[PDB]
RNA sequence: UUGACCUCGGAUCAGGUAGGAGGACCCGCUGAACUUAAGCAUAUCAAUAAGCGGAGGAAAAGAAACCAACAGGGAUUGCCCUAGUAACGGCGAGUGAAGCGGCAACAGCUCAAAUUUGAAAGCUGGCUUCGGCCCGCGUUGUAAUUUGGAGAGGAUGCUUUGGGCGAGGCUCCUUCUGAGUUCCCUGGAACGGGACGCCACAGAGGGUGAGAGCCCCGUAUAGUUGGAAGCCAAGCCUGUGUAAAGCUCCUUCGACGAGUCGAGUAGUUUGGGAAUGCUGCUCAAAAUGGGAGGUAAAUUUCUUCUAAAGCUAAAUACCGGCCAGAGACCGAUAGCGCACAAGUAGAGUGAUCGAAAGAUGAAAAGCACUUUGAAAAGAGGGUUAAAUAGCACGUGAAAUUGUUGAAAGGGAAGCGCUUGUGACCAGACUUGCGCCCGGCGGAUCAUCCGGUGUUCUCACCGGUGCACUCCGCCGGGCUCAGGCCAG
RNA sequence: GGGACCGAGGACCGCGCUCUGCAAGGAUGCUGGCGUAAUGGUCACCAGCGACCCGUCUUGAAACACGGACCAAGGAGUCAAGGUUUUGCGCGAGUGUUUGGGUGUAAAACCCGCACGCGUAAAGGUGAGAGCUUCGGCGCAUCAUCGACCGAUCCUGAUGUAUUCGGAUGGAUUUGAGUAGGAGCGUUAAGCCUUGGACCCGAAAGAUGGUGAAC
RNA sequence: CCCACCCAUACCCCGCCCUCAGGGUAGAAACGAUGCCCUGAGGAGUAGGCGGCCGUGGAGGUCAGUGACGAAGCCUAGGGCGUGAGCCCGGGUCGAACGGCCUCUAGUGCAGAUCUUGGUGGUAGUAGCAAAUAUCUAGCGAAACCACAG
RNA sequence: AAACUUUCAACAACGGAUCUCUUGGUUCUGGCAUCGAUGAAGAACGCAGCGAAAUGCGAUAAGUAAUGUGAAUUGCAGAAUUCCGUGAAUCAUCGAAUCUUU
């Protein structure tokens, strides 16, 4: 149960905040879990998704498909994986919008800021591990 | 709204025209113009007897009657057929006023939720907790739009002594769905008779029983009520040598044979 | 007695528990500001004026200058150490003087005064 | 209402006010009360644990158990039993338990320095010149108009000489 | 002739300030009528609405010319009771307080009436190298001292101090912090069902292709990263001038607000003719004074305060401002007029008046292409789980209408009771048990053995075998019981 | 002797009799029929009999009048305050925590210091009479009657009295919302009354503040 | 004047419903003593009074309730229950929630108010070609009125 | 005979009730105090590739600077514009500026 008076359990306010969110808040919302191997390697559970990550889809009709994220459409709250596409009536191959919660990141697009994010998350998790151990 | 329904500029057309005598909106270039107003019978009108905030929302109850009800609920909680008639799964519970030792819940022994779950499962309160977990259903009606989306049953009420057990056990029983915690000095009738139905399942501590002896002598202006009946067993009253001896012979049977 | 427009002047009290919480938090703020000090000032015992309430006593506004001088508390130090002073009240009798002087020496017996620096 | 409708359709951000109160609810600092103040306890329970009185007035409601914070005559003289025309003005002459109480007594009873006020160079020169002509006759120094222009009384000059150590 | 002073002006001189908005709450001024009194005029409405002026986060009020008659209380404000009491009234309608008592909050002060007179000690500006220099204001009074439950001046002996840095702390924003996408089925999609787990000071809430604690955001708890401004503050530097302050004593003093009180009179207002208060006109004070009360008590005895100058936080109000959190509220004819282009479209010369209008699908995958033709239109064909979900889009009632099938009718139709005819639809008792042989297999059978849990004498397993007993299963044999309707 | 309609109940108990069982406190026995349909139901039509168009209002009654094109949705004795009667409940000569304080898992629940409101305070005889009884009687509540006391009123007018104050004894056709062994306080539910928009809709008006013109 | 016959909701006999009344029922019953069993009588009704029961929105408790293997809604020349308001099931459509029971709560039940809003008709393809958009024939096209019919 | 009228059933219309939903209203509660001659509230005109509405802004005109985050925006079209970077963004914060006519 929420205790802090600043938190709201209103369904109306939560839906308004979700569907009227800025682009950076949408970045934070559009997060994906890491793979098992990356979770043991970096000690990080989930990261906000970005273009250039290689993911595997674990839910939906396109399960077990892998590919590189070529677009992060924050407005439509969806990502566009490579070769996971469709066909229009005319025959054009349009991408299929997949929610980032339905994928698992198998390879990260490692830059300096992403390494900083991973280091901060790992430091917090290990400091809570120290707090739990003693 | 105080002004809802009647923040309209409308006048009655009178008996000049062959229309109903209702105040209609003035103007001549709107869909609204010409429509009736100021009535519970009218669309976009003021309703009959608008609700006001100075309705009586709260009820004053005498403290003596509240203490009588709390004592009656406590007495009903010590009867196990009332516990199952209320809807509690206590068929594996060893004794109905389920007293556990305070050493199991003293300090930080139950302050973690896993330890509280283990204690509930060990003392026999497991099935009641699992009932609440499996009874989660979505609420029928518009209350889902108003912050009440789910409904579930009520599990065991933990009554403890905050002086002798501390308040760290409150944290360990908080996340377990259904189980509730209440100090022995501030018992709540809304929790002892949920829905107005008597016989709540209660796990006490030992210090809870000792201070339960203690705090009913500390209420000023209240003493534990004397019943108007000493022996509430009617079969003991009627089927006893005392009454059966002076009874005259029966004048008939339970079923009367038809004579003609 | 609803001859006037009483609808526009109905005062409900749905904010009674919220105002109680506000008052308790104000007392907590007073405690935070005056950390070892009590949040209240010392007030004298006075007799209720009328013949109906002459038998009982209550708390007054502040101690008389004669009461402070008889208790051994100087006038200018008294408001700075938690005692209330009232220059309007007079003793008028040797029995209120003795009672409030006893109250002041009882307060002096249980006071921990700290040096200025 | 029209303003609130405008902000709902506007792209301008909602300026969220932080919950900054004017008065702090907990004591702070490096003093004795701050390190023993429980933020999850009320005023009465905290002052009970300290061993101090929170409210000096008459009790206004019921309290919790263990509150401890909400408190010959030759001449017929009512005040002669009360005894133990000038009094000390800037201070009082006051003559198992909880640890905070004992710490407060200890810090209130510890010895302090005084910072004794010295004298100016010109005052010392004046008192010196006054001694070099009369020696010890403080009455003659008071009578002297030349060396004592402000016609100070011999008692004041004797007190100033004693403070200077010139007797 | 020249130079002051005083008074009245000018300047596109220098430095400032006011206006408008908002106005829920607040302070003033002004001020109705309907209505009730079953008519109506006093009264009520109402010292309200409208109108005008002026502020703030609160405002106002406020440290007694007070209450009281006490064994006294002790600035103001607000809550509770006082109390529908006192009082006033076509004594009708009715109107209608206050002291005391309980509580919330508490805080006290600044001037004028004094000679600094052994020293205008005071202040606004301009110039600055920022350290101290000029002009001006002011003696028709700027500092210090004092403010009547006081005070001053001397004497007296004790007791008190002033500035500048400041580690660090509090408040508030911020970074980070638990656990399944394991297996099977259904399904377009698992967030559903079944199995096995895990986290929980976190099972609030939201999203994700359907009900997700463990997919994601957040949530709980202590910390932790960086920053902003206030306030507090351990300590560390310095202080100074015969400088300031409190108390005590007394062969010395002690100034307290005037066209104001008050009297007469006219309005207005109040529960209030000591006019309840206020205002206008005429007259116009006092100094052991003045105001207000108490009292039949022997004469106005007594009691209690100081008006005509001023400041001040808190408790109190709040339809407005910056936010935040909620509800036994409403759910698109409801809830604000407005869930959406809403004070919009539109109407009026104008003041003003003022609507209707939400929902494809999980995802546009929003119908390619072939073929009629001039259409906001079809037929094939395609997407989709579904197109009888096709931006006329969730579901799709009734009124009303068209196509097909059946029946009836032409000086009303419709209804009640009772058969008949035609068409269509349903489908009656759910239809069982017991005995006697033969074979087989289990047991509650064996005074067989071993084990487990118990309410400690009852249950449950494992292994033995069919002498007895009891169950079933299979093959034969027989009897009985069976629902409704007629005679 | 012929016919019609009916078969209620469900071990035994009873009255009886023509007594090895019967027609005696309510129907059984035998035979036959029933699943490509026993028996029902719905719609339409025909047929026999019956039958003034609904709501409101007036009148002794009618008769007039008012409203009704149809369908969907909406649509009218409510909520407060103050009295009063009755049912339930707690405590009871007392009762009422919730102005407020404390506390809290935080508008909840739990606790109560002084007030305050309302109320209470400032046993007699005889006769009936429920009930009980050791059969002798004891007698509830309530009623009738005879008595007792008091605020106050009518005289008679004590010891006494400060010397102008007082009421003792005996008498009255006295009263009272008086006494004569307390019943109230709080709450819940229902009904009624008064005032607020007051069950819903429906004038002419009057007042305040504005907008325009032009007789 | 005599005989036979016809039929009212009237009388008589039987069945069934309800109400009222009388009786029985505990070392407990072969049925919630708020239950059951036996017996008798009675049944019009405006204003009005009392009781029981059905339905709607929401709240607390419970049914270890139903549900994408299909909730709610809607349609239905289907099947039942109840005196009745109503309730339950079948068939079709549909696509995300909903129901019973015990209490609580109310903006809780419509045929009408020259009722409000929306939609839709006969008149009527008629009158007329009119503001908006002297005849016949194309195209356009109302209104009054309307309980049902002469 | 055919035509018309009435009733019933299936299908197709008209219409938008019912059900379910809700970035809306409404009522309550809590913290806080902030418009303007340094030009406010309000009115008008302009600024985008396609802008009809709404919103943002002012000739520095769907914005400039500074800080933070860290890889977009997005209906279509374009960029040799940026991806181990003082750096995208119809991003957030916000202390510096620009700020037409009234």
PDB file of C-alpha atoms (C1' of nucleotides) in Angstrom, chain G:
ATOM      1  C1'   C G   1    -106.564 -22.462 -10.887  1.00  0.00           C
ATOM      2  C1'   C G   2    -103.172 -27.032 -11.623  1.00  0.00           C
ATOM      3  C1'   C G   3     -98.764 -29.749 -13.285  1.00  0.00           C
ATOM      4  C1'   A G   4     -93.843 -30.087 -15.273  1.00  0.00           C
ATOM      5  C1'   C G   5     -89.623 -27.570 -16.730  1.00  0.00           C
ATOM      6  C1'   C G   6     -85.220 -23.267 -17.492  1.00  0.00           C
ATOM      7  C1'   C G   7     -81.131 -20.631 -14.948  1.00  0.00           C
ATOM      8  C1'   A G   8     -77.741 -15.979 -10.686  1.00  0.00           C
ATOM      9  C1'   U G   9     -71.630 -14.563  -8.114  1.00  0.00           C
ATOM     10  C1'   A G  10     -77.972 -16.782  -4.235  1.00  0.00           C
ATOM     11  C1'   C G  11     -78.584 -21.931  -1.121  1.00  0.00           C
ATOM     12  C1'   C G  12     -76.600 -27.164  -0.393  1.00  0.00           C
ATOM     13  C1'   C G  13     -72.221 -31.192  -0.915  1.00  0.00           C
ATOM     14  C1'   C G  14     -66.925 -31.835  -2.178  1.00  0.00           C
ATOM     15  C1'   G G  15     -61.940 -29.965  -3.627  1.00  0.00           C
ATOM     16  C1'   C G  16     -58.204 -25.912  -3.472  1.00  0.00           C
ATOM     17  C1'   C G  17     -56.097 -20.615  -1.904  1.00  0.00           C
ATOM     18  C1'   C G  18     -55.695 -16.932   1.839  1.00  0.00           C
ATOM     19  C1'   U G  19     -57.113 -14.605   6.528  1.00  0.00           C
ATOM     20  C1'   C G  20     -58.851 -15.006  11.429  1.00  0.00           C
ATOM     21  C1'   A G  21     -59.809 -17.977  15.672  1.00  0.00           C
ATOM     22  C1'   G G  22     -59.393 -22.390  18.858  1.00  0.00           C
ATOM     23  C1'   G G  23     -56.269 -26.692  20.244  1.00  0.00           C
ATOM     24  C1'   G G  24     -51.487 -29.749  20.460  1.00  0.00           C
ATOM     25  C1'   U G  25     -46.123 -29.977  20.221  1.00  0.00           C
ATOM     26  C1'   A G  26     -39.202 -30.871  25.206  1.00  0.00           C
ATOM     27  C1'   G G  27     -35.129 -35.072  30.318  1.00  0.00           C
ATOM     28  C1'   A G  28     -37.211 -32.195  22.287  1.00  0.00           C
ATOM     29  C1'   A G  29     -38.816 -33.306  17.519  1.00  0.00           C
ATOM     30  C1'   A G  30     -38.150 -37.765  12.401  1.00  0.00           C
ATOM     31  C1'   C G  31     -39.584 -29.463   9.075  1.00  0.00           C
ATOM     32  C1'   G G  32     -35.750 -22.747  10.456  1.00  0.00           C
ATOM     33  C1'   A G  33     -40.970 -23.493  18.153  1.00  0.00           C
ATOM     34  C1'   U G  34     -39.978 -16.880  13.464  1.00  0.00           C
ATOM     35  C1'   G G  35     -41.063 -24.670  12.719  1.00  0.00           C
ATOM     36  C1'   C G  36     -44.632 -28.454  12.425  1.00  0.00           C
ATOM     37  C1'   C G  37     -49.653 -30.994  13.248  1.00  0.00           C
ATOM     38  C1'   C G  38     -55.269 -30.914  13.983  1.00  0.00           C
ATOM     39  C1'   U G  39     -60.077 -28.257  13.783  1.00  0.00           C
ATOM     40  C1'   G G  40     -63.804 -24.442  12.664  1.00  0.00           C
ATOM     41  C1'   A G  41     -65.618 -19.983  10.468  1.00  0.00           C
ATOM     42  C1'   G G  42     -65.126 -16.177   6.912  1.00  0.00           C
ATOM     43  C1'   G G  43     -63.754 -13.764   1.791  1.00  0.00           C
ATOM     44  C1'   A G  44     -67.500  -6.726  -2.044  1.00  0.00           C
ATOM     45  C1'   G G  45     -65.153  -2.100  -1.479  1.00  0.00           C
ATOM     46  C1'   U G  46     -63.615   4.740  -2.845  1.00  0.00           C
ATOM     47  C1'   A G  47     -60.930   8.241   0.701  1.00  0.00           C
ATOM     48  C1'   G G  48     -57.934   6.123   4.385  1.00  0.00           C
ATOM     49  C1'   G G  49     -54.803   2.717   7.807  1.00  0.00           C
ATOM     50  C1'   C G  50     -51.555  -1.723   8.540  1.00  0.00           C
ATOM     51  C1'   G G  51     -48.539  -5.942   6.832  1.00  0.00           C
ATOM     52  C1'   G G  52     -45.867  -8.940   3.430  1.00  0.00           C
ATOM     53  C1'   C G  53     -43.265  -9.396  -1.034  1.00  0.00           C
ATOM     54  C1'   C G  54     -40.950  -8.070  -6.232  1.00  0.00           C
ATOM     55  C1'   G G  55     -37.581  -4.828  -8.958  1.00  0.00           C
ATOM     56  C1'   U G  56     -33.289  -0.639  -9.721  1.00  0.00           C
ATOM     57  C1'   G G  57     -28.152   2.276  -8.714  1.00  0.00           C
ATOM     58  C1'   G G  58     -24.280   1.946  -5.064  1.00  0.00           C
ATOM     59  C1'   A G  59     -21.668   0.089   0.098  1.00  0.00           C
ATOM     60  C1'   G G  60     -19.832  -3.845   4.045  1.00  0.00           C
ATOM     61  C1'   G G  61     -19.760  -9.363   4.622  1.00  0.00           C
ATOM     62  C1'   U G  62     -20.236 -14.017   2.224  1.00  0.00           C
ATOM     63  C1'   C G  63     -21.103 -17.735  -1.734  1.00  0.00           C
ATOM     64  C1'   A G  64     -13.119 -20.820  -1.684  1.00  0.00           C
ATOM     65  C1'   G G  65     -19.944 -17.823  -6.804  1.00  0.00           C
ATOM     66  C1'   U G  66     -20.333 -17.292 -12.940  1.00  0.00           C
ATOM     67  C1'   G G  67     -16.974 -15.857 -16.946  1.00  0.00           C
ATOM     68  C1'   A G  68     -12.810 -14.970 -23.590  1.00  0.00           C
ATOM     69  C1'   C G  69     -14.039 -23.290 -23.703  1.00  0.00           C
ATOM     70  C1'   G G  70     -17.761 -16.455 -23.771  1.00  0.00           C
ATOM     71  C1'   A G  71     -19.862 -11.783 -18.729  1.00  0.00           C
ATOM     72  C1'   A G  72     -23.431  -7.883 -19.566  1.00  0.00           C
ATOM     73  C1'   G G  73     -26.953  -6.291 -23.140  1.00  0.00           C
ATOM     74  C1'   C G  74     -30.515  -7.232 -27.139  1.00  0.00           C
ATOM     75  C1'   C G  75     -33.969 -10.427 -30.367  1.00  0.00           C
ATOM     76  C1'   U G  76     -37.002 -14.791 -30.063  1.00  0.00           C
ATOM     77  C1'   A G  77     -44.952 -18.039 -34.668  1.00  0.00           C
ATOM     78  C1'   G G  78     -39.430 -22.041 -27.649  1.00  0.00           C
ATOM     79  C1'   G G  79     -39.527 -24.697 -22.216  1.00  0.00           C
ATOM     80  C1'   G G  80     -41.068 -23.974 -16.958  1.00  0.00           C
ATOM     81  C1'   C G  81     -42.236 -21.571 -11.854  1.00  0.00           C
ATOM     82  C1'   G G  82     -45.226 -17.816  -9.104  1.00  0.00           C
ATOM     83  C1'   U G  83     -52.401 -15.389  -7.647  1.00  0.00           C
ATOM     84  C1'   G G  84     -49.291 -11.264  -8.992  1.00  0.00           C
ATOM     85  C1'   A G  85     -45.298  -7.460  -9.436  1.00  0.00           C
ATOM     86  C1'   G G  86     -41.737 -10.888 -11.434  1.00  0.00           C
ATOM     87  C1'   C G  87     -38.051 -15.028 -11.792  1.00  0.00           C
ATOM     88  C1'   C G  88     -35.394 -19.384 -14.173  1.00  0.00           C
ATOM     89  C1'   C G  89     -33.892 -22.205 -18.551  1.00  0.00           C
ATOM     90  C1'   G G  90     -33.448 -23.119 -24.306  1.00  0.00           C
ATOM     91  C1'   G G  91     -32.149 -20.839 -29.551  1.00  0.00           C
ATOM     92  C1'   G G  92     -29.662 -16.579 -32.119  1.00  0.00           C
ATOM     93  C1'   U G  93     -26.595 -12.212 -31.765  1.00  0.00           C
ATOM     94  C1'   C G  94     -22.490 -10.387 -28.932  1.00  0.00           C
ATOM     95  C1'   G G  95     -17.524  -9.374 -26.981  1.00  0.00           C
ATOM     96  C1'   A G  96     -15.572  -7.979 -20.731  1.00  0.00           C
ATOM     97  C1'   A G  97     -17.425  -7.985 -17.150  1.00  0.00           C
ATOM     98  C1'   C G  98     -21.486  -9.881 -13.751  1.00  0.00           C
ATOM     99  C1'   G G  99     -24.812 -12.451 -10.173  1.00  0.00           C
ATOM    100  C1'   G G 100     -27.386 -14.789  -5.516  1.00  0.00           C
ATOM    101  C1'   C G 101     -27.851 -14.402  -0.157  1.00  0.00           C
ATOM    102  C1'   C G 102     -27.578 -11.259   5.012  1.00  0.00           C
ATOM    103  C1'   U G 103     -27.298  -6.239   6.285  1.00  0.00           C
ATOM    104  C1'   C G 104     -26.492  -0.711   4.801  1.00  0.00           C
ATOM    105  C1'   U G 105     -27.729   3.310   1.628  1.00  0.00           C
ATOM    106  C1'   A G 106     -30.814   6.303  -2.149  1.00  0.00           C
ATOM    107  C1'   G G 107     -31.161  11.321  -7.286  1.00  0.00           C
ATOM    108  C1'   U G 108     -34.936   3.676  -6.525  1.00  0.00           C
ATOM    109  C1'   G G 109     -40.184   1.662 -10.143  1.00  0.00           C
ATOM    110  C1'   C G 110     -44.639   6.195 -15.137  1.00  0.00           C
ATOM    111  C1'   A G 111     -49.586   5.999 -19.664  1.00  0.00           C
ATOM    112  C1'   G G 112     -51.094  10.803 -19.091  1.00  0.00           C
ATOM    113  C1'   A G 113     -48.850  16.644 -16.457  1.00  0.00           C
ATOM    114  C1'   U G 114     -51.963  21.553 -23.963  1.00  0.00           C
ATOM    115  C1'   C G 115     -44.890  17.374 -19.521  1.00  0.00           C
ATOM    116  C1'   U G 116     -38.894  17.953 -21.355  1.00  0.00           C
ATOM    117  C1'   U G 117     -35.305  16.153 -25.242  1.00  0.00           C
ATOM    118  C1'   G G 118     -34.497  13.147 -29.375  1.00  0.00           C
ATOM    119  C1'   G G 119     -36.432  10.196 -33.279  1.00  0.00           C
ATOM    120  C1'   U G 120     -40.453   8.783 -36.508  1.00  0.00           C
ATOM    121  C1'   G G 121     -45.733   8.826 -39.077  1.00  0.00           C
ATOM    122  C1'   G G 122     -51.178   9.521 -41.465  1.00  0.00           C
ATOM    123  C1'   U G 123     -52.491  13.921 -43.776  1.00  0.00           C
ATOM    124  C1'   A G 124     -49.396  13.425 -48.775  1.00  0.00           C
ATOM    125  C1'   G G 125     -46.061  12.756 -53.327  1.00  0.00           C
ATOM    126  C1'   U G 126     -51.482  16.504 -51.170  1.00  0.00           C
ATOM    127  C1'   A G 127     -51.902  21.958 -51.172  1.00  0.00           C
ATOM    128  C1'   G G 128     -48.601  24.650 -54.215  1.00  0.00           C
ATOM    129  C1'   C G 129     -43.681  26.539 -57.499  1.00  0.00           C
ATOM    130  C1'   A G 130     -44.514  31.464 -52.460  1.00  0.00           C
ATOM    131  C1'   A G 131     -39.100  33.546 -47.420  1.00  0.00           C
ATOM    132  C1'   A G 132     -35.134  29.527 -47.075  1.00  0.00           C
ATOM    133  C1'   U G 133     -33.662  25.499 -50.116  1.00  0.00           C
ATOM    134  C1'   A G 134     -54.941  30.436 -67.042  1.00  0.00           C
ATOM    135  C1'   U G 135     -54.254  24.781 -67.936  1.00  0.00           C
ATOM    136  C1'   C G 136     -51.159  19.926 -68.675  1.00  0.00           C
ATOM    137  C1'   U G 137     -46.487  17.545 -67.921  1.00  0.00           C
ATOM    138  C1'   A G 138     -41.183  16.714 -65.608  1.00  0.00           C
ATOM    139  C1'   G G 139     -38.312  18.223 -61.020  1.00  0.00           C
ATOM    140  C1'   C G 140     -39.086  20.148 -55.879  1.00  0.00           C
ATOM    141  C1'   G G 141     -42.429  19.801 -52.076  1.00  0.00           C
ATOM    142  C1'   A G 142     -45.051  21.557 -46.755  1.00  0.00           C
ATOM    143  C1'   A G 143     -48.627  22.979 -42.764  1.00  0.00           C
ATOM    144  C1'   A G 144     -53.156  22.831 -39.554  1.00  0.00           C
ATOM    145  C1'   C G 145     -55.076  18.582 -37.364  1.00  0.00           C
ATOM    146  C1'   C G 146     -54.676  13.418 -35.385  1.00  0.00           C
ATOM    147  C1'   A G 147     -57.770   8.256 -28.829  1.00  0.00           C
ATOM    148  C1'   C G 148     -59.588   4.827 -32.140  1.00  0.00           C
ATOM    149  C1'   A G 149     -64.034   5.112 -36.633  1.00  0.00           C
ATOM    150  C1'   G G 150     -68.182   7.218 -39.020  1.00  0.00           C
TER     151        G G 150
END
